[PDB]
Amino acid sequence: GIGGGGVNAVNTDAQALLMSDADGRDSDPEVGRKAAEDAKDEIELRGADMVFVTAGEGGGTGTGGAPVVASIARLTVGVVTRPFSFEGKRRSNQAENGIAALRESCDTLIVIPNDRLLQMGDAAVSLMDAFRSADEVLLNGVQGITDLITTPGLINVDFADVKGIMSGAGTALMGIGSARGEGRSLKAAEIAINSPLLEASMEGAQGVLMSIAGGSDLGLFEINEAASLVQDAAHPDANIIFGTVIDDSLGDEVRVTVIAAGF
Amino acid sequence: LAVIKVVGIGGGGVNAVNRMIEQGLKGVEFIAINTDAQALLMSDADVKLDVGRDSTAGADPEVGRKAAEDAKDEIEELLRGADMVFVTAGEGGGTGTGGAPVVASIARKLGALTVGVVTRPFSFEGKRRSNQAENGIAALRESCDTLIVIPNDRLLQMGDAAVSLMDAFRSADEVLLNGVQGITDLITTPGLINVDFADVKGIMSGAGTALMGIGSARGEGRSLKAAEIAINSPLLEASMEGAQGVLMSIAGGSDLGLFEINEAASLVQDAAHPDANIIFGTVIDDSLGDEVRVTVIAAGF
Amino acid sequence: HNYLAVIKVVGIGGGGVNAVNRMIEQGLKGVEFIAINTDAQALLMSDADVKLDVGRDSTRGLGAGADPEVGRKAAEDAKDEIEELLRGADMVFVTAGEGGGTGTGGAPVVASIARKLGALTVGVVTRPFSFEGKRRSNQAENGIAALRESCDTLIVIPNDRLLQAVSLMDAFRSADEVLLNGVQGITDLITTPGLINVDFADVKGIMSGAGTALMGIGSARSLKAAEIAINSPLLEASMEGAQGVLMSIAGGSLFEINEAASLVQDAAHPDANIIFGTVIDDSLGDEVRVTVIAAGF
Numbered sequence: 102g103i104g105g106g107g108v109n110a111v112n113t114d115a116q117a118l119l120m121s122d123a124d125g126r127d128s129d130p131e132v133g134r135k136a137a138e139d140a141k142d143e144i145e146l147r148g149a150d151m152v153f154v155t156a157g158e159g160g161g162t163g164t165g166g167a168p169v170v171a172s173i174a175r176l177t178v179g180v181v182t183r184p185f186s187f188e189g190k191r192r193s194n195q196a197e198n199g200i201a202a203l204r205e206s207c208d209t210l211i212v213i214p215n216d217r218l219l220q221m222g223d224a225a226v227s228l229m230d231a232f233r234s235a236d237e238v239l240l241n242g243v244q245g246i247t248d249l250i251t252t253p254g255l256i257n258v259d260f261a262d263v264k265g266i267m268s269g270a271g272t273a274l275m276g277i278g279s280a281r282g283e284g285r286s287l288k289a290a291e292i293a294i295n296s297p298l299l300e301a302s303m304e305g306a307q308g309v310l311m312s313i314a315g316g317s318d319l320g321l322f323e324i325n326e327a328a329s330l331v332q333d334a335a336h337p338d339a340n341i342i343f344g345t346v347i348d349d350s351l352g353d354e355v356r357v358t359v360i361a362a363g364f
Numbered sequence: 365l366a367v368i369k370v371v372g373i374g375g376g377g378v379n380a381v382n383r384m385i386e387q388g389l390k391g392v393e394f395i396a397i398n399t400d401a402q403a404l405l406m407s408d409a410d411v412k413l414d415v416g417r418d419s420t421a422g423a424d425p426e427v428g429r430k431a432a433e434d435a436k437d438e439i440e441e442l443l444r445g446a447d448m449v450f451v452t453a454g455e456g457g458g459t460g461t462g463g464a465p466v467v468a469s470i471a472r473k474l475g476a477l478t479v480g481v482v483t484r485p486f487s488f489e490g491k492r493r494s495n496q497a498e499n500g501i502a503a504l505r506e507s508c509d510t511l512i513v514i515p516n517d518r519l520l521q522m523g524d525a526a527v528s529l530m531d532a533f534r535s536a537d538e539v540l541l542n543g544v545q546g547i548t549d550l551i552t553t554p555g556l557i558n559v560d561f562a563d564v565k566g567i568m569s570g571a572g573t574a575l576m577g578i579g580s581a582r583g584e585g586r587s588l589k590a591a592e593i594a595i596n597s598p599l600l601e602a603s604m605e606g607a608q609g610v611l612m613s614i615a616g617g618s619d620l621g622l623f624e625i626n627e628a629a630s631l632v633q634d635a636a637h638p639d640a641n642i643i644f645g646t647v648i649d650d651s652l653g654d655e656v657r658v659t660v661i662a663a664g665f
Numbered sequence: 666h667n668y669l670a671v672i673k674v675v676g677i678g679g680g681g682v683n684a685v686n687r688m689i690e691q692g693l694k695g696v697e698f699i700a701i702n703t704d705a706q707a708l709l710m711s712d713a714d715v716k717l718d719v720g721r722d723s724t725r726g727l728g729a730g731a732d733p734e735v736g737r738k739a740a741e742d743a744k745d746e747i748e749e750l751l752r753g754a755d756m757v758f759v760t761a762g763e764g765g766g767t768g769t770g771g772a773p774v775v776a777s778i779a780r781k782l783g784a785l786t787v788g789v790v791t792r793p794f795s796f797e798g799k800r801r802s803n804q805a806e807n808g809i810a811a812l813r814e815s816c817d818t819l820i821v822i823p824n825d826r827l828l829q830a831v832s833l834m835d836a837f838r839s840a841d842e843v844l845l846n847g848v849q850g851i852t853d854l855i856t857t858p859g860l861i862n863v864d865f866a867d868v869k870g871i872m873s874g875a876g877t878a879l880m881g882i883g884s885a886r887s888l889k890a891a892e893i894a895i896n897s898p899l900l901e902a903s904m905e906g907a908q909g910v911l912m913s914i915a916g917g918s919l920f921e922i923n924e925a926a927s928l929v930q931d932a933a934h935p936d937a938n939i940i941f942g943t944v945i946d947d948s949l950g951d952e953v954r955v956t957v958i959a960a961g962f
């Protein structure tokens with residue numbers, strides 16, 4: 102993530118650029134401008150059709166340097182992070198402006214509040230479990246919607262389906278959930294819509310891309326259970342795209358990742 | 365006796381009327397209507413009709429509608445003078461979805477008792493399809509007299525375990541036929557109790573929004589159990605309760621009992637609304653030997 | 666010392682014959698199976714060792730009336746042919762699905778013919794479903810009544826408790842083999858014994874003169890599959906005084922064994938009597954059958 106707390110998540114400062122796992126150097130929000138902001142043509146976009154922006158708001162240029170990627174071609178949807186309550190008024194003062202161009206020059210954004218992520222863990226955590234125990238959720242809004250095209254499985258979804266509903270959609274939330282043992286797919290879908298993260302606003306939206314993962318074990322009958330919980334669930338006149346995923350490291354778990362759009 | 369001409373519009377219909385043919389389904393005449401002429405090469409329909417000048421019914425029911433209409437005559441020659449005319453399909457796409465409201469409408473204008481036997485999409489089959497299907501079902505109901513609908517959703521219970529997609533629509537391939545088989549055999553292969561075309565006419569006529577269930581069994585009280593399950597078939601949705609019009613049929617071997625017929629029938633009417641009009645029908649089918657089938661058809665609400 | 670036990674199992678009426686073929690297909694051995702029925706349609710389709718036509722063949726749309734007078738008639742009418750069929754048996758199981766007619770009223774006869782001959786006679790039968798109507802539940806209680814006073818031992822199993830709506834259609838015709846597990850529940854101890862053998866004579870004491878009995882199985886590895894059987898509602902929880910209990914286990918291989926044995930007696934009045942046993946049925950990996958018959962009241 103193009104940020105002094107968004108780099109440390111993916112799995113201007115000199116000692117930060119040199120930890121990017123795939124194979125400048127002189128540093129506040131506006132730091133991303135004459136240390137970060139490079140040319141008008143830096144995607145002459147080449148080898149693929151999307152990449153994501155994991156540039157939240159929990160460090161350095163995650164505010165003034167985040168929307169450097171937003172105007173990159175004014176399709177890409179950023180998976181951000183609104184700051185915790187206790188992380189000061191100064192980081193909260195960098196809230197709207199650090200997201201404003203991420204929802205004026207960028208396609209769509211998924212404003213994952215770690216404030217609300219208090220319900221994901223055990224009881225108490227730390228600042229070190231705000232870019233670690235909030236990587237799990239931070240990958241979700243990404244991985245949820247990549248896996249439909251990279252690794253589908255028992256059901257498939259086009260390139261043009263995601264990019265035909267999640268295109269320039271601006272305001273967007275998600276909602277995730279997990280389950281093992283019986284009822285798996287409907288247990289986790291009923292977690293997915295009730296998860297303190299979609300802010301109970303799916304019914305207001307007009308376009309939802311439900312994902313659902315698990316082994317190749319994953320029955321065709323389980324998938325039909327979750328699918329129903331959507332036709333009732335969202336506005337009864339929306340644009341919904343289902344679709345499945347294969348991940349055989351889950352075995353018995355089924356990663357039901359819902360994503361919202363169309364407010 | 366009676367001229368039964370089964371028509372399978374849609375790709376799903378034309379695919380399902382093949383299953384009919386590859387099962388025998390006597391006393392009918394098969395007609396496959398679809399847009400991509402290519403797809404009709406694989407049909408074993410005795411008659412095949414092509415309805416597509418240009419489409420490059422590409423997921424748009426309104427092509428299918430127009431297609432059905434621009435071949436309004438082609439069909440009204442295929443359907444001329446025919447006591448019983450069926451119009452099975454897969455609602456969801458376009459060729460069926462749009463068409464059936466015509467082919468059916470055409471049979472009905474031709475005075476032929478017209479029975480629809482269509483399916484609703486799996487909800488995994490996307491959300492568009494549902495809505496496509498949904499106004500298309502509203503379209504038959506308002507066109508053909510009876511419309512047995514079979515929600516696929518319901519077809520896939522947990523007692524059909526790790527299935528597939530081929531197996532899925534194959535599970536439907538049987539079920540479409542079953543709402544046909546169990547109305548036609550009455551007329552086309554009546555066993556000990558005759559129920560002539562006329563009877564089915566009066567129960568089916570004007571009814572609509574019909575449902576159906578199926579149950580086979582054997583052993584002690586076989587016909588009770590085979591009937592019991594059909595009553596409880598999820599494919600009905602607790603509807604038996606209130607159906608003012610019920611068509612049953614206890615298809616079994618030549619030597620099927622009266623005591624048997626009686627107490628399976630007597631198990632149906634009791635579920636049914638107590639005012640409900642009812643009809644027995646037995647059918648001779650040797651492929652069972654030791655077992656019996658039962659196909660209650662709730663109709664009118 | 667000719668270790669041979671002559672064990673036969675007759676399936677009377679559709680219920681019995683159905684059940685006997687379910688026994689044939691699921692691979693019970695060491696036993697002559699017998700199908701007796703009124704319709705010769707279903708007899709020729711059965712794979713029973715010896716099939717017997719008793720009922721007068723009846724014109725289309727009669728016969729199938731389910732009047733246990735007519736079944737009782739049919740066997741008493743062909744009582745000779747039944748006497749020879751079960752002649753020099755050692756132990757004769759008698760299975761049926763009560764409520765009906767032919768099996769309802771036919772079992773009483775065949776059971777009581779095994780008795781005069783001098784077999785250990787056993788009745789493994791079922792009480793029809795509650796939805797089948799009052800006439801059958803009536804017609805069953807009388808056929809049960811007779812068979813209780815014909816067989817040395819009778820195992821009655823409600824097909825109503827054997828259900829617990831959509832897919833419990835495959836909870837009668839694939840749940841009736843409770844009858845089968847009822848039979849091999851005793852048979853497979855003598856015919857295919859395990860690491861603890863318990864021959865015919867062990868059984869002859871703990872059955873001859875009981876009258877009434879009940880059963881329950883378990884699937885499994887054997888540590889956690891043992892409780893399963895006694896607790897199974899099928900047994901009516903009537904292990905607060907089952908005065909004469911039998912128990913069996915099937916698979917590969919003492920610790921496994923004594924896991925369950927260190928439990929059995931902890932149930933009913935242990936002043937009575939219990940018999941253990943073992944079976945070699947290599948048709949099952951981690952699974953091991955844990956059948957428990959509970960006689961004597």
Ligand SMILES: Nc1nc2c(ncn2[C@@H]2O[C@H](COP(=O)(O)OP(=O)(O)O)[C@@H](O)[C@H]2O)c(=O)[nH]1
Pocket residue numbers: 373374375376377379380421423453454455456457458459460461483484485486489493533534536537540
């Ligand atoms: N019974 C049956 N249903 C099918 C088959 N293939 C697909 N379906 C279902 O029927 C629906 C209708 O599609 P279809 O009739 O092929 O589209 P159309 O030919 O353009 O009307 C689909 O959404 C599927 O859920 C099949 O072979 N048999």
